[PDB]
């Protein structure tokens, strides 16, 4: 322990959340979760003070769903401090610079180091965000205004880590990453259905919310048949078919989320402890969706930055050609969903490649994650040996072999299945999209599975 010791004085200077005196009941853990997400939601509606012009094209638009970010607000960075600092912690632990340990004083030191790097990432990303050209020109903005925006994003990033740690310490129902990602996705879907925002294009005033539009169209046009057709088949604004597609995808993903292989196990050390070890089809809950989205979104940012500066280069053009900003050629084009059914017909190769990439990457990410997160059959077999658990119909030596048959298939096929559901949601035009809806369903199921876990104990 050499790296954690030198930064130890700098770790304790940040606020920490008190460990609960006793376990909080699930009733009040939901309430603190609701309070935590309410604070995050309020912070993501309050714009930064120093913004001069939010008119330029947004540079990080593709991570906004997976970073729980909102451009130009206090939640501009979103959960980026949590994701990046946690990544540095895993990379440092994986490469043996630091040790996570098990001593309560060592775990607190590990938490303090993660919080310290979250501030470093928050400050580093705040400067990068300012210099990207958003909020206006930094030279015209001024040193004081640019510094003030960094201060606002620094305290906001401190709040996110404080809110994230609040959920982890035992007051909430999980992590800030899962809660804040799902909260924005659920907020977006409800907004597309109930927003009172109205837009006029000449024909009249039309509500942006699909359900509000249906009631407005029926009343204004006196139960017109065309009003129902417009409410369901609206291309300019969200329509009811996209909402029905959203509900259909929710139902289908929920059905496959409940798929599980139930291993009948007994304990050999302490006899009488019998139970079921479930191997879910979605073995990796939503990591393949996050890993795929992060890979494509990060690749999009790199492609646009290289296209703007080093335009004309063959390698830059191969990485992606951009024409709002959407890919039209290069590698980034084949990683984007088809625009419409006509787009599939005119370019059948891109639709096939996108489906193959979406299924292949999610299947590959899922099977790779189990070899990193510690859910590989060898690591699960070791946990069985540590707890003395064996499978009913199999010998004590044949625990890893049976796990080798189920877990690698569950990860690879589960990632492929969760990759296909995102395509189906995208191809059906579901409000929420493929990544967002699948993220929302899987995160909510993690909260439901906590409820049944606490209920089963009682």
């Amino acid at each position: 322990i050499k790296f954690l010791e030198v930064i130890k004085p700098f770790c304790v200077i940040l606020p920490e959340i008190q460990k609960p005196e006793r376990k909080i009941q699930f009733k009040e853990k939901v309430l603190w979760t609701a309070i935590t997400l309410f604070i995050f939601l309020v912070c993501c509606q309050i714009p930064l003070f120093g913004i001069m012009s939010s008119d330029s094209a947004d540079p990080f638009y593709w991570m906004r769903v997976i970073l729980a970010s909102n451009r130009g607000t206090l939640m501009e960075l979103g959960i980026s401090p949590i994701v990046t600092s946690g990544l540095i912690m895993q990379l440092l632990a994986g490469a043996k610079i630091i040790e996570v340990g098990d001593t309560p004083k060592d775990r607190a030191l590990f938490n303090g180091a993660q919080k310290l790097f979250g501030m470093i990432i928050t400050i580093g990303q705040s400067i990068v965000y300012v210099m990207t050209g958003m909020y206006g020109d930094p030279s015209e903005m001024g040193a004081g205004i640019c510094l003030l925006i960094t201060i606002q994003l620094f305290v906001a990033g401190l709040i996110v880590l404080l809110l994230d740690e609040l959920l982890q310490k035992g007051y909430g129902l999980g992590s800030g990453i899962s809660l804040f990602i799902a909260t924005n996705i659920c907020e977006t879907i409800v907004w597309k259905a109930f927003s009172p925002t109205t837009v006029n294009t000449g024909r009249g005033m039309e509500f942006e919310g699909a359900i509000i539009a249906l009631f407005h169209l029926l009343a204004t046009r006196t139960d017109k048949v065309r009003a129902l057709r417009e409410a369901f088949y609206r291309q300019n604004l969200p329509n009811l078919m996209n909402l029905i597609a959203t509900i259909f995808v929710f139902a289908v993903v929920i059905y496959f989320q409940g798929f599980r292989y139930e291993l009948p196990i007994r304990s050999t050390k302490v006899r009488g402890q019998i139970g079921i070890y479930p191997i879910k089809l979605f073995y990796t809950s939503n990591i393949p969706i996050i890993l795929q989205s992060a890979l494509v979104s990060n690749l999009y940012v790199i492609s646009q930055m290289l296209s703007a500066r080093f335009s004309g280069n063959l390698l830059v053009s191969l990485l992606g050609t951009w024409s709002r900003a959407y890919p039209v050629g290069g590698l980034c084009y084949y990683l984007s969903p088809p625009e419409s059914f006509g787009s599939v017909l005119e370019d059948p190769v891109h639709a096939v490649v996108y489906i193959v990439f979406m299924l292949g990457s999610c299947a590959f990410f899922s099977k790779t994650w189990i070899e990193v997160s510690g859910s590989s059959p060898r690591d699960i077999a070791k946990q069985f040996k540590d707890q003395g658990m064996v499978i009913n119909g199999k010998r004590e030596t044949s625990i890893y072999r049976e796990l080798k048959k189920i877990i690698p298939t569950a990860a690879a096929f589960g990632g492929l299945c969760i990759g296909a559901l995102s395509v189906l949601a995208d191809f059906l035009g579901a409000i929420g999209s493929g990544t967002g809806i699948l993220l929302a369903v899987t995160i909510i199921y993690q909260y439901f599975e906590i409820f049944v876990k606490e209920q089963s104990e009682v």
């Binding site: 990046t84 540095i88 990432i121």
Partner: peptide
């Protein structure tokens, strides 16, 4: 996304 996660870039240190």
């Amino acid at each position: 996304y996660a870039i240190a």
